[PDB]
Amino acid sequence: MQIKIKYLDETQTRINMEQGDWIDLRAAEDVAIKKDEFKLVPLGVAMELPEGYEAHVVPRSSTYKNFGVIQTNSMGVIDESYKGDNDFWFFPAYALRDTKIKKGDRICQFRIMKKMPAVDLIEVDRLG
Amino acid sequence: MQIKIKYLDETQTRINKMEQGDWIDLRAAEDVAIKKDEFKLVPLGVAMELPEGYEAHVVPRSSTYKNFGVIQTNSMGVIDESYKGDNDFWFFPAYALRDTKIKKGDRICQFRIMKKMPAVDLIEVDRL
Amino acid sequence: MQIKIKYLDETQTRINKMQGDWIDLRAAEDVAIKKDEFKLVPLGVAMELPEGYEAHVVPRSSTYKNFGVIQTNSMGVIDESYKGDNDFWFFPAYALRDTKIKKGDRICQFRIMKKMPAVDLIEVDRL
Numbered sequence: 001m002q003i004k005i006k007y008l009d010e011t012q013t014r015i016n017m018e019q020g021d022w023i024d025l026r027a028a029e030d031v032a033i034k035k036d037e038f039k040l041v042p043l044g045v046a047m048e049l050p051e052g053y054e055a056h057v058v059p060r061s062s063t064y065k066n067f068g069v070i071q072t073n074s075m076g077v078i079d080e081s082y083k084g085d086n087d088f089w090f091f092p093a094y095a096l097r098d099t100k101i102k103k104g105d106r107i108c109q110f111r112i113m114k115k116m117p118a119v120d121l122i123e124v125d126r127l128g
Numbered sequence: 129m130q131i132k133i134k135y136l137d138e139t140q141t142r143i144n145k146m147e148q149g150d151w152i153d154l155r156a157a158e159d160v161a162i163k164k165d166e167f168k169l170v171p172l173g174v175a176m177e178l179p180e181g182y183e184a185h186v187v188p189r190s191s192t193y194k195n196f197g198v199i200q201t202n203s204m205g206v207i208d209e210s211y212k213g214d215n216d217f218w219f220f221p222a223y224a225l226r227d228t229k230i231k232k233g234d235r236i237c238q239f240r241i242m243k244k245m246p247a248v249d250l251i252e253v254d255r256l
Numbered sequence: 257m258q259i260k261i262k263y264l265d266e267t268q269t270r271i272n273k274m275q276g277d278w279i280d281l282r283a284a285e286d287v288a289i290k291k292d293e294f295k296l297v298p299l300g301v302a303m304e305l306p307e308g309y310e311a312h313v314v315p316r317s318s319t320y321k322n323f324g325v326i327q328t329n330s331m332g333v334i335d336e337s338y339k340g341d342n343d344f345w346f347f348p349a350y351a352l353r354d355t356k357i358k359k360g361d362r363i364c365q366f367r368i369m370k371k372m373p374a375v376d377l378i379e380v381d382r383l
């Protein structure tokens with residue numbers, strides 16, 4: 001199973017695994033964020049995911065410790081269909097304190113996972 | 129694979145975007161106003177009987193923070209197959225980072241289903 | 257399918273068997289957190305998961321109203337790799353109000369999941 005991945009540019013740090021571990025993604029540019037402010041931290045990457053698969057994106061264990069940001073959407077769902085040449089991943093960050101992220105910083109991690117199977121949604125007037 | 133769904137009332141907007149594999153959006157069952165640093169359970173006006181052996185996972189949409197200034201306090205909501213009774217309506221536990229207003233009908237979060245953990249024996253052991 | 261689990265001390269309340277359900281985990285000691293402050297809440301447990309699996313840890317839906325805390329990493333990911341006698345799970349809590357969590361309190365919950373299959377990251381210039 002392969003993932004095709006476009007980098008924003010040559011300065012981005014490429015990421016190498018087939019170990020099953022979640023893969024760290026990194027900030028594409030310096031972002032500074034005041035306490036109680038919001039910013040998209042661009043991750044400088046676009047990917048074509050395997051057919052029938054999602055990416056899930058959550059912070060790293062140490063993200064809060066080292067940057068004082070929480071992830072606004074809790075968990076990011078990157079769908080297989082987000083595979084365009086301008087479809088760059090971002091990390092939506094709310095700073096609970098003054099913070100600076102530097103280009104290259106590892107700020108979140110992801111894995112892939114089979115989309116849910118197909119499903120008939122059937123309205124009913126009463127449940128058991 | 130089918131899910132039964134019951135709606136609080138005819139007012140509610142059927143979520144008739146059954147899966148092409150994608151997560152599915154849920155909507156505020158009523159007008160809800162939440163002030164800065166206030167918490168509210170936002171009712172989603174749906175009860176469901178998930179497939180045997182499954183659970184549902186709920187998370188915010190990508191734009192939920194931009195548009196309503198709320199985060200989901202439980203990060204990823206877990207809904208077990210057993211939450212299927214006739215009064216088991218889904219909610220969105222929302223904490224507000226600014227003064228905000230959700231209107232009835234609004235898409236505020238999204239779900240998919242996924243198979244439960246297989247059974248597991250838990251052994252206590254002195255060391256590892 | 258088997259998980260080997262090691263409690264911190266005798267004091268800790270062992271957990272029941274279960275069925276596929278997320279298992280609740282308990283705070284290992286009383287912890288007080290002021291508004292707008294962060295603290296790791298020990299869950300007094302370390303575990304050897306199955307070869308090829310990870311654990312996901314998230315709050316109960318009631319953690320906020322009962323205890324006033326969110327989990328700053330959203331969902332903790334614990335790898336098969338974290339299986340040593342000192343590898344004790346924690347709940348990273350940030351308090352949005354003053355709060356005292358009390359030993360024994362069930363504050364978050366977990367399950368296991370097969371890890372991602374092996375994949376190739378093939379760099380490309382266009383998509």
Ligand SMILES: O=c1ccn([C@H]2C[C@H](O)[C@@H](COP(=O)(O)NP(=O)(O)OP(=O)(O)O)O2)c(=O)[nH]1
Nearest residue numbers: 057073076077078082088089090091092190191
């Ligand atoms: O944390 C995230 C979350 C989403 N994303 C990406 C994936 C998503 O496809 C895109 C946002 O554009 P839309 O809001 O239109 N996508 P959406 O999730 O709304 O898809 P849909 O409308 O199909 O439900 O941002 C991230 O990069 N990081």
Ligand SMILES: O=c1ccn([C@H]2C[C@H](O)[C@@H](COP(=O)(O)NP(=O)(O)OP(=O)(O)O)O2)c(=O)[nH]1
Nearest residue numbers: 186205206207208211217218219221316317318
């Ligand atoms: O975001 C959510 C999360 C859960 N739920 C529902 C489904 C689930 O069966 C029920 C309880 O979930 P939790 O286990 O996370 N909270 P708690 O453990 O307090 O409830 P219970 O004691 O029933 O397990 O609430 C929601 O409607 N929205």
Ligand SMILES: O=c1ccn([C@H]2C[C@H](O)[C@@H](COP(=O)(O)NP(=O)(O)OP(=O)(O)O)O2)c(=O)[nH]1
Nearest residue numbers: 061062313332333334335338344345346347348
């Ligand atoms: O909420 C959490 C999250 C992680 N953990 C555990 C598992 C993890 O291995 C450990 C943190 O160690 P590291 O800082 O080395 N992070 P991790 O092992 O995930 O990094 P890598 O991606 O290199 O494995 O804490 C918790 O107890 N609670």
Ligand SMILES: [Mg+2]
Nearest residue numbers: 280316317365
């Ligand atoms: Mg529970």
